[PDB]
Ligand binder design. Structure first.
Ligand SMILES: [K+]
Ligand SMILES: [K+]
Ligand SMILES: [K+]
Ligand SMILES: [Mg+2]
Ligand SMILES: [Mg+2]
Length: 136
RNA sequence: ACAU
DNA sequence: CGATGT
């Protein structure tokens, strides 16, 4: 089982969990940063991981790219497969933004098609995903 | 347990 | 040490 180097890798970064959430996507081969989301003041690790995959899907579809996406998040991979982010985060005025983005990401999944393979990055075998923030 |  | 998730 080898790395598919012709791929996009995504990851969340946070200050606290729940806390400030951001995410980015990189070229797995080169590490070039292809997109970065502006920090969202409150969210969870898994909401951010989910938004990162969906953004990757949208980014690759817009560019007519058939590359797969790597994520290290078992949870977010399943949420994308299900088209449903089963987060426990309370809904209130401070979490409104992240929940709006998550709701809109689900809605995009429910209105668009893609063949993009969404693959588990095998951290145990390969080290940290190339999109990692270096904060652990 | 496993994945973050 | 705490948290988010299956
Ligand atoms: K990190
Ligand atoms: K990890
Ligand atoms: K746990
Ligand atoms: Mg991650
Ligand atoms: Mg990481």
């Amino acid at each position: 089982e080898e790395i598919i180097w012709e791929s996009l890798s995504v990851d969340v970064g946070s200050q606290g969990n729940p806390g400030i959430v951001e995410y980015k996507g990189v070229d797995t081969k080169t590490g070039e940063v292809l997109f970065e989301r502006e920090p969202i003041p409150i969210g969870t690790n898994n909401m951010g991981e989910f938004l990162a995959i969906v953004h990757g899907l949208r980014y690759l579809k817009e560019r007519n790219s058939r590359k797969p996406i790597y994520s290290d998040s078992q949870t977010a991979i399943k949420w994308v497969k299900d088209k449903k982010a089963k987060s426990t985060l309370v809904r209130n005025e401070e979490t409104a933004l992240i929940w709006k983005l998550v709701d809109e990401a689900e809605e995009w999944l429910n209105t668009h098609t893609y063949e993009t393979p969404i693959l588990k990055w095998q951290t145990d075998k390969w080290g940290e995903i190339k999109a990692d923030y270096g904060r652990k």
